[PDB]
Design a protein around this nucleic acid. Sequence first.
RNA 1: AGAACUUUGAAGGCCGAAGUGGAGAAGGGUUCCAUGUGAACAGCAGUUGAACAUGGGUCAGUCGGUCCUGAGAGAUGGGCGAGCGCCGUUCCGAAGGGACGGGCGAUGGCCUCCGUUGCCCUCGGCCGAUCGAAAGGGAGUCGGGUUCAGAUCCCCGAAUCCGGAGUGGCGGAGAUGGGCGCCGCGAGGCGUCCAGUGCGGUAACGCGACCGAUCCCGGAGAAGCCGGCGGGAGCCCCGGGGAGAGUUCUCUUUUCUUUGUGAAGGGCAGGGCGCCCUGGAAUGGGUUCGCCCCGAGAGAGGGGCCCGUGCCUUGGAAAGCGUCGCGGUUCCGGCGGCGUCCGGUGAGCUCUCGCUGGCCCUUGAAAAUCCGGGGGAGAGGGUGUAAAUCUCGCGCCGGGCCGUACCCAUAUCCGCAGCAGGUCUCCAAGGUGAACAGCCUCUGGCAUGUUGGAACAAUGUAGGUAAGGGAAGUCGGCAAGCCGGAUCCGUAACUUCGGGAUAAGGAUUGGCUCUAAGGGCUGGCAGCCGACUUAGAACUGGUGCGGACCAGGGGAAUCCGA
RNA 2: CCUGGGCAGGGCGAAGCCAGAGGAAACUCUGGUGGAGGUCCGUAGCGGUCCUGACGUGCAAAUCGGUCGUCCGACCUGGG
Lengths: 91, 51, 114, 69, 120
Amino acid sequence: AKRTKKVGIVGKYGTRYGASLRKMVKKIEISQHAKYTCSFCGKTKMKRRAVGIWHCGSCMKTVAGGAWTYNTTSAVTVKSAIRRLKELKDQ
Amino acid sequence: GRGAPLAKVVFRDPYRFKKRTELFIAAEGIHTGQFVYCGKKAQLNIGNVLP
Amino acid sequence: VQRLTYRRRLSYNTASNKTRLSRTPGNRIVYLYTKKVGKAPKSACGVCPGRLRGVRAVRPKVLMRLSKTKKHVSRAYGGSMCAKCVRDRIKRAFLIEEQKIVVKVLKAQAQSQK
Amino acid sequence: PRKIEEIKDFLLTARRKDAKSVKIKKNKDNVKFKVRCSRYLYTLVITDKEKAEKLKQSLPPGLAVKELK
Amino acid sequence: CRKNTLARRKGRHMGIGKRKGTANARMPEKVTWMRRMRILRRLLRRYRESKKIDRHMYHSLYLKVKGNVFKNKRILMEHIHKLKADKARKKLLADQAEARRSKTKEARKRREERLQAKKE
RNA sequence: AGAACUUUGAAGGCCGAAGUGGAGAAGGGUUCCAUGUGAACAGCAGUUGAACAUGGGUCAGUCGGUCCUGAGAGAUGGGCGAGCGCCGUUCCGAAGGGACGGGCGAUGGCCUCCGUUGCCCUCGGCCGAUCGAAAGGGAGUCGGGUUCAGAUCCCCGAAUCCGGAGUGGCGGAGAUGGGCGCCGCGAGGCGUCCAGUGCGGUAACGCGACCGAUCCCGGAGAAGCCGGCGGGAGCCCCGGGGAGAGUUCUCUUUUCUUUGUGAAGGGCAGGGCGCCCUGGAAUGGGUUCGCCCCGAGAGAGGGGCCCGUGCCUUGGAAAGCGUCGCGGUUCCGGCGGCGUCCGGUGAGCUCUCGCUGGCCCUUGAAAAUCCGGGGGAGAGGGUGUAAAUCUCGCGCCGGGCCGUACCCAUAUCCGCAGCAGGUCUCCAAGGUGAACAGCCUCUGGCAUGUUGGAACAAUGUAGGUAAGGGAAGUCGGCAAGCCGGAUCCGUAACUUCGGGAUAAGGAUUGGCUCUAAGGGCUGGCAGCCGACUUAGAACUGGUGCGGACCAGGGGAAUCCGA
RNA sequence: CCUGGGCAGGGCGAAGCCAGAGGAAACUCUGGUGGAGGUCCGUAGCGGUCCUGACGUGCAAAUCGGUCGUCCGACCUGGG
Ligand SMILES: [Mg+2]
Ligand SMILES: [Mg+2]
Ligand SMILES: [Mg+2]
Ligand SMILES: [Mg+2]
Ligand SMILES: [Mg+2]
Ligand SMILES: [Mg+2]
Ligand SMILES: [Mg+2]
Ligand SMILES: [Mg+2]
Ligand SMILES: [Mg+2]
Ligand SMILES: [Mg+2]
Ligand SMILES: [Mg+2]
Ligand SMILES: [Mg+2]
Ligand SMILES: [Mg+2]
Ligand SMILES: [Mg+2]
Ligand SMILES: [Mg+2]
Ligand SMILES: [Mg+2]
Ligand SMILES: [Mg+2]
Ligand SMILES: [Mg+2]
Ligand SMILES: [Mg+2]
Ligand SMILES: [Mg+2]
Ligand SMILES: [Mg+2]
Ligand SMILES: [Mg+2]
Ligand SMILES: [Mg+2]
Ligand SMILES: [Mg+2]
Ligand SMILES: [Mg+2]
Ligand SMILES: [Mg+2]
Ligand SMILES: [Mg+2]
Ligand SMILES: [Mg+2]
Ligand SMILES: [Mg+2]
Ligand SMILES: [Mg+2]
Ligand SMILES: [Mg+2]
Ligand SMILES: [Mg+2]
Ligand SMILES: [Mg+2]
Ligand SMILES: [Mg+2]
Ligand SMILES: [Mg+2]
Ligand SMILES: [Mg+2]
Ligand SMILES: [Mg+2]
Ligand SMILES: [Mg+2]
Ligand SMILES: [Mg+2]
Ligand SMILES: [Mg+2]
Ligand SMILES: [Mg+2]
Ligand SMILES: [Mg+2]
Ligand SMILES: [Mg+2]
Ligand SMILES: [Mg+2]
Ligand SMILES: [Mg+2]
Ligand SMILES: [Mg+2]
Ligand SMILES: [Mg+2]
Ligand SMILES: [Mg+2]
Ligand SMILES: [Mg+2]
Ligand SMILES: [Zn+2]
């Protein structure tokens, strides 16, 4: 069945620590405990290690990623800007 | 004690027949098996430390 | 139900003082010590985890007593590579050598055209 | 404690010098020969009493022999 | 205590008033589930080894035993009897319909051969 | 001489496996043990003691220190300081005395040829001397017996490691093959030439051994906590057998005790495998309690590896144990017979191995040591004759220094003492029960905690009841008492929607007969063999049922602090 | 700071998963499995609230007895 209606993953804390804090911890605990699809092997076995380290069960290929998700949107912006300024007139 | 993840990049030493091992701060988006290019005229991508 | 005790003058249940229990010929439950388990040498350099096959797995200083069959595999890169690394590195080295020959003769043909 | 199976290899080992003692033990269903050479106790188990008697007959004479009960 | 334990095995001294832990403490839910589902998940193998159920319906009943549908071995066997008796009826009726279709296609192709021979 | 206390017997008790038990670390220092005394000390006494006096007792290549580094501490170089000195641990330093081969030279032994020494060439980061753990790292020993006191040390028997062996102990590999031509019937031999730094399996890998230097690479050493689950052991439990003991008023094929195989080697179970081959899968399939896995190769079949602490074998029945007898005063680890069996079950306990998962802005030690691999400078017999070498099987020699007694505590330590205080760990049975809860027994200890006798006044200190009323007492429901376990019902206001909540309130609970359900193993749906749980029914006891022990009063509100 | 050691049973039942029912979709409902928590009753352990209980020239220059708080942790603890 559906055992909780709102708290989702944050129900392990209970009635303490505060509403907005649980609300803001929800949206990134789901991110850090979610399995991600590896861009290398194509399986869905990414798992977060210690902070900043991501690991896939197949092929043991360990990628330095974001602290809570797999890619920071700012980091994707920086990578697009780096390839643009790369092929901009060859330095 | 450091929030940054720490990369262990191995180099070839051009003077003694020996591999040397250094410790770089892991730039966002490198992974085990990506080559790291460093030097003056090194091409510009993520991880490539250059002047 | 015979309660039984350490034989040495240790007391603390350390990692080194790790014990089992047996039965004497003299009809008595005694408390016999145990050498620690020696994990096998694991694979060379970054590959999928798993110890190297066909190696007598012991503590380090045990390896002085052992003969020169039970420490290595008959293959080249015996007790270091896990043989999937061997059948990768051979193909990798050969193909990179062939690509270097192709790039070198391409430079030669480019200079011939120029 | 090592176990010998052939009579030949046992006998050669018995004549292999600095083996100082042979015990002979009789049993309900078999008979055993103990050789105390060095670093080891060489046991030959055999079930045929006639073979044991002819082996002890052909046993080398300078070596000590002790029967156990 | 041997006399008392034989009285326990009869089923005496075991009402409400001489229990003190909960039912989940006396015989746990996880233990009930492990025993129950190891029994039901090896009975399906004992059928699948022989021929009691084919490879495709094995997986459906495997998931339906993983889900809390079947309580025990007897009603599992009663339900496998019903599914097998349903599959046999449906395959019999389909084979009879395919026999009728084979008769009609045979007759049509033979009539086409008859008209071909009337042409040549 | 003397007995409320000493010792023995009998009886009744306690500690009740998280102990008043069996042993240790730190500490104590002879208290350990025997003999003798009872003057003082033990707060009464004492024939006794941890008191006094005499005399004994601590045996180790394989137990630990020694060795390694950790948190750190500390010296020279350097700097500072009136100055004993301080700072400082790579910083401002010429901080390696070693080796490989080669050459020149010398010396000595069997001057064959080995062994030294001097010089020269080549090579060689030390992230720095040295110290730092009787719980971290660290090769290698277990069983039986033995004393008034020892014990993995003494003995008996069985093993193992580390070194060393130069004229290289003894064997085995390296190793002896093939062609040519001739002779010989042939078997073989002659002569010439050539090879020979091992072999097998498609693999995963295997065998008894398998030349290797400077150097380089890697692994082991080397990893947290918590869940689950599987195997193995030990213990407990059940059924049958065998020895001995108890009960027999009446019954009880009854109750209890006892019922063994060391390290090391070989083999076989078993478990695990991210380890290979054949082979292509979707109507998706395989598997866990949970997951998880699959074209980067699932299922299926066949192979391979590791742990093998389990079983068998060697040790090993000669011992050990139980029991029944026979001899020697003693001195005998005497002597002899008999036996030391079968099986089964398990959310059972405890330990360990392995798998997998969860948790993290915690990522969970370093080094001595040892090994493998990459490379191939070199080394060696050159042929009918054998070496360079060897981590293989045997054989020889040695393993130095120190600690080792005992308490480890309601009497050997600290606390001014034989002081309810304090102090670090291991093993831990049966029943009830959820359980290591509390209560009662068994192994194993013990005399009630620095005294006894007589009587049962007050006040006490700990405990327990009370007719009626139920907070009226008192600053105050302080104290004590009520509910208390489980099952089945039922659960509000409020709210961060997770709770509140075991809310509040009810009922039921015993003994004894059953009934129903919940499984394993066999065979071409049927036959044998078993676990402890749940639901229901009847009978019945003086309304009695968590019967002792175990054990939440509750609600309504306010203030403050998440 | 380093190196080791230690913590019985149970109640509450999140994420993830499975099955069934409904829905056109979004998704919802029901029964299991699952075992998270600076989580709840409670053992050892650690503290010391109340009785202003015992003692108060004591057993003791801070103890004892009931009654207590917390026990996977910002936990407890030995040695260096
Ligand atoms: Mg559950
Ligand atoms: Mg008298
Ligand atoms: Mg007394
Ligand atoms: Mg008692
Ligand atoms: Mg004790
Ligand atoms: Mg006195
Ligand atoms: Mg005396
Ligand atoms: Mg004494
Ligand atoms: Mg004295
Ligand atoms: Mg010895
Ligand atoms: Mg040692
Ligand atoms: Mg100094
Ligand atoms: Mg100076
Ligand atoms: Mg040191
Ligand atoms: Mg140690
Ligand atoms: Mg002995
Ligand atoms: Mg002793
Ligand atoms: Mg040697
Ligand atoms: Mg197990
Ligand atoms: Mg063995
Ligand atoms: Mg079992
Ligand atoms: Mg001692
Ligand atoms: Mg005391
Ligand atoms: Mg005390
Ligand atoms: Mg224990
Ligand atoms: Mg018990
Ligand atoms: Mg029970
Ligand atoms: Mg007495
Ligand atoms: Mg006393
Ligand atoms: Mg009254
Ligand atoms: Mg009354
Ligand atoms: Mg009333
Ligand atoms: Mg008032
Ligand atoms: Mg009170
Ligand atoms: Mg009352
Ligand atoms: Mg309330
Ligand atoms: Mg409370
Ligand atoms: Mg207000
Ligand atoms: Mg507060
Ligand atoms: Mg809590
Ligand atoms: Mg509460
Ligand atoms: Mg309580
Ligand atoms: Mg407590
Ligand atoms: Mg206390
Ligand atoms: Mg206190
Ligand atoms: Mg107090
Ligand atoms: Mg007071
Ligand atoms: Mg007084
Ligand atoms: Mg609590
Ligand atoms: Zn991957």
